Amino acid sequence: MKAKELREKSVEELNTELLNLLREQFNLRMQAASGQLQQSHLLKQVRRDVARVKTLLNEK
C-alpha cells in the first residue's frame, strides 16, 4: 500500500489517518476488550497502517 499511498495530497492524506483513528483502531480496541472480536490480527495491521501514514505525511 505504501507505493500507492506515497502519491497523495497533504490535506487528503490526513483524512486516511483520521479514518484509521476514528473507526478501525478505536472500534477494534473497544470490540476486542468485550470479547466479540474473533479476528485479532486486525489490531496489528491497522497500527502499522497508521505508522505508515504517519511516516508518509512527514515530508515537510
Partner: protein, 92 residues
C-alpha cells in the same frame, strides 16, 4: 477542540458488579482510560465517540497488583478508571 488525540484516551469498558449496578441504578459508565486522560479529555472523548450527554466524570488511578509466580516477582500496570456520569438522555 483537541482533535485526533481524543481517540487515544478511552481504552475499554469496565465489566464488574460495581460497573453493572451503576448502569441501571446510578446511570453511569465505568471505563478504563489512558494514564494521562484528564476529566475534561475523558468528558470530551465520551461526548464525541460514544455521543452521549455527559454530566460529570470521576477519575481514579488503580494500583498494579504484585503477582509473584514461579520464582520471580512481577507487578501489573497502573491503569486509570473513570466513573463517567451521564444525563437523562442515555443508552447502553
Amino acid at each position: 477542540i483537541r482533535e485526533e488525540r481524543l481517540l487515544k484516551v478511552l481504552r475499554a469498558p469496565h465489566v464488574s458488579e460495581k460497573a453493572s449496578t451503576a448502569m441501571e441504578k446510578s446511570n453511569t459508565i465505568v471505563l478504563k482510560v489512558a494514564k494521562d486522560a484528564t476529566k475534561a479529555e475523558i468528558k470530551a472523548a465520551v461526548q464525541k465517540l460514544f455521543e452521549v450527554e455527559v454530566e460529570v466524570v470521576n477519575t481514579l488511578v488503580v494500583k498494579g497488583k504484585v503477582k509473584r509466580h514461579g520464582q520471580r516477582i512481577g507487578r501489573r500496570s497502573d491503569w486509570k478508571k473513570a466513573y463517567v456520569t451521564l444525563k437523562e438522555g442515555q443508552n447502553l
